[PDB]
Amino acid sequence: KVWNARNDHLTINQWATRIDEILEAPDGGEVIYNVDENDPREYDAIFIGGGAAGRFGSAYLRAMGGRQLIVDRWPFLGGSCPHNACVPHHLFSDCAAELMLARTFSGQYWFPDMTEKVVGIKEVVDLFRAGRNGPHGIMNFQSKEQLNLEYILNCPAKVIDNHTVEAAGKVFKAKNLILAVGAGPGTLDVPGVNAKGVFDHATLVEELDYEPGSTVVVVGGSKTAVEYGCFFNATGRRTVMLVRTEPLKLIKDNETRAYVLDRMKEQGMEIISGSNVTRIEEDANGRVQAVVAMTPNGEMRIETDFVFLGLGEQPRSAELAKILGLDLGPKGEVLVNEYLQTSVPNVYAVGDLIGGPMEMFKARKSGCYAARNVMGEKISYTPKNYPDFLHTHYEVSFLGMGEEEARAAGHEIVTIKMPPDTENGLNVALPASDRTMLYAFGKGTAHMSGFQKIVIDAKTRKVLGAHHVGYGAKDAFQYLNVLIKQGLTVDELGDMDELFLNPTHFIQLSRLRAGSKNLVSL
Amino acid sequence: KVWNARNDHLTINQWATRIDEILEAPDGGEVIYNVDENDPREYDAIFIGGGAAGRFGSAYLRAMGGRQLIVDRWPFLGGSCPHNACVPHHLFSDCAAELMLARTFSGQYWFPDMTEKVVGIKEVVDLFRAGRNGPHGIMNFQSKEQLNLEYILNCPAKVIDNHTVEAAGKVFKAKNLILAVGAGPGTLDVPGVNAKGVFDHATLVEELDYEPGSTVVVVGGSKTAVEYGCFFNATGRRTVMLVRTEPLKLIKDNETRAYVLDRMKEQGMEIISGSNVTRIEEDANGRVQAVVAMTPNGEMRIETDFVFLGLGEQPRSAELAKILGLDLGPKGEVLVNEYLQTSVPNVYAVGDLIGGPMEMFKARKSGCYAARNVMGEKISYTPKNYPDFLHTHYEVSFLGMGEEEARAAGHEIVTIKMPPDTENGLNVALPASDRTMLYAFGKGTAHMSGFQKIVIDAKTRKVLGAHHVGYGAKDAFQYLNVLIKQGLTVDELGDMDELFLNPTHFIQLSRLRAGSKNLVSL
């Protein structure tokens, strides 16, 4: 039941294996108990959850000289991201981008005929399962031996009160409490929602014990939905998305959002806007069999032994806002002030638990900023004006105001974009750069070369927003955003040193546009 | 002979078609003559060469209100990049990256067996030729109709003197002259260097009238050499690189350069350092047959009907520095002061013509900066501290000092990198992000997940240099460099918002490392 790992010093590999074993043990495995039982000082903070925010938070506070304790249901630190979130998601996104390639040039060059070819989903999510523990074991080993971090894994945390928490059957006290439990996968209140064939991002990497059929239904219209959507599509499975409202609302710039959509459509993806699932039919055995759903244009039935749920993630606050009596928002997000402080004192919330944006960076900063505050610091954090992205078969990166948006905000904008305005529209070997070259030179695929734009303020010449579809631009937005935040003028942008061919052709195009007396041109 | 295109207004497509025709016509085609014969003002500057530097410079000067003229040998604006340089090089790089993937997972997943499979080089360079004319046509159409730029294409420029140039059989006078003729492919003074089978970057996209054999010989050790080298290797052909000195010197941080090499080695590439070509044997017919060369370890003969020369590019200064009597450097570079001014007054040099760095950004900036100066501005330009990159089967981005390099400069460095120090070395699913997920989770491919490092100065903790091997990092370095030049501290870097999984895991690692009292750790 309880394993005092304190003095064992397992190898990363040993960790990886031990993790697998616990993770697969039928009874839930033993409890990893790792606490320095010689230290006299009391816990400056106990992290409820050792994932993105939890882990980071703990490492940062520990580095400040404080004493911390992490508690997690899972036998490893890290959170959703490396077990069923980001990571496995990127894996599928990679395939998505590759398959769309293999399929655009089926037979041609070194590409096999994809016609009639449907890739094995299970097989790939199986690969993921086969290695995802490697990093875990590294996280565990590296946290205990190098960071001296104290934690208790594979054990649910019992927050008794404001200064006490229980785990491993013992009782703990701490000057503070920082909640980092995150959010759980969204769900649908409809009959059949539990039919064997239904899946969500998390349940997919643990329950896919069969290979899906020629058709798949994805419910949702934002990130994860589109991401996993375009991946199933890529596997050569008719994919029908049922969106409650509108897909990819996150892509504020219209043209960009449009280009993306048309690309998905073009891959055979069927996106239904304003569609609510009526119910999910089963078999005599109990597995999914077909999906019935209402759409603005009447009901419709669709046969499929596979359904993936891509609804928003739900902050796991309920039970905690009950024990501590915390304030919650309209989405169940634990309210926190500019210091990650909840209504209750000495208590902090940091993960997805505080709602959007529900990204790693927020999780890591928030969990870090909080630990800093408990150590007496008065740092305030309010995520606003940040870079973003999402996959499909392409990489969609965006930051700032979309075109339309800027006008509504009063600005008199001008816009530089690629490809350019020509009677040939998107059917040009523009824009091009790494991983879009083939699309650019292929026969009738140029319109796939990718799409990008930048919003600039005429008079004040400041960059208001950057939008790019393609590849190799994401990592750039992290840094491009910072500069934009300092006050980047089209002039200052056109003065940088580009690396042609660059995923984003903003630098050169700015230099050129900036030269004109009046920015207007488009 | 001379076509007054002035009043014709062709379509982008007509331009493309016209360009292909002129480009394939046996007598060299007609001269495109596009000069505004109504304007009274004299030319503020005539650009000798209308490629990267020329075209751009012209656009900027035109935008400033000045009158300009472009002249050229080629029937299109743009230069080497879109015809036989960058672009085609990228197309080969993508294939190089895609093939390495495909080959690492032969038979696996949707990946066909690659064993014994050799991709068609001719076919892929044939695809490039089939569409490279699209962008020219656009460059041409856009330049004349939208930018009102004046030019003369498909006609070598005759610089009579300091203020006069001849073209299309007419004589022109200009207040200034700005030479942007660039550099021509390097060569080897050895017997057989001309045997039909010998190629270079520019001759490959115009004379590859056959399909290479099972073996290839590349002469060189830097960018284009390795670039085309990993591609031929990728097509599954024994590739032997003969390096006069040492390969990839351009990658200053040792570890980085080391990783990159091992990878290539791993791909079957044979790289010979301190190797010079003795001679190139031919056939009764006259095509390459084998290569003989000296290596530290005695001479060696290697049979091949295909040889690619990847030597440095040689500034096209000879004949111009003879007419204007310009000062030159040890490499043939037209000397210019901080104002792109040559020894001769009213004469500016800007392309690869001025030597290194020979990249698009320099050619464009210098091209642009010079034009600004002729308009009266006193802008000085001296390329230093710029981002850089080059392909293999991986994308290699570096900027600033390498580790070893920082020390030699007196700095007492610390270094945060991926993967981390562990008994599993590189064989871990770290680092990972887009397009490296499969390598990361494959069986025994983790060591291919990639490599990346950052050099930080203990005390002042300012960033000295970033190094990354993988994909989707190049474009980031453009902006990451800008911030590093502002004086970026490991603290300010850890504070940015990352987009996990990010090609570069710098942000989050620095936030964590910056927390510690003393950066030391490695």
Ligand SMILES: Cc1cc2nc3c(=O)[nH]c(=O)nc-3n(C[C@H](O)[C@H](O)[C@H](O)COP(=O)(O)OP(=O)(O)OC[C@H]3O[C@@H](n4cnc5c(N)ncnc54)[C@H](O)[C@@H]3O)c2cc1C
């Ligand atoms: C499919 C998908 C893809 C994504 N891709 C990206 C991406 O590419 N980039 C990005 O920046 N973000 C991405 N995100 C979002 C990102 O995963 C989250 O914002 C981030 O993981 C949240 O971190 P956190 O620490 O708040 O929560 P988590 O990392 O989810 O961790 C919460 C932790 O608390 C523990 N816990 C929960 N309840 C209890 C309990 N009762 N007792 C004990 N422990 C408990 C968990 O076991 C876990 O360790 C993605 C999300 C999904 C669903």
Ligand SMILES: Cc1cc2nc3c(=O)[nH]c(=O)nc-3n(C[C@H](O)[C@H](O)[C@H](O)COP(=O)(O)OP(=O)(O)OC[C@H]3O[C@@H](n4cnc5c(N)ncnc54)[C@H](O)[C@@H]3O)c2cc1C
């Ligand atoms: C294989 C290869 C790959 C490369 N990849 C990259 C890359 O990825 N990124 C990057 O930034 N740089 C890259 N470069 C380098 C880059 O191509 C050059 O630095 C840049 O093109 C130089 O521009 P320029 O204007 O100086 O010369 P060019 O663009 O080469 O143009 C010179 C112009 O002058 C004309 N001209 C020459 N002689 C005459 C004459 N006698 N009469 C009339 N016109 C004449 C030409 O026809 C041409 O239009 C690469 C180079 C090579 C060889």
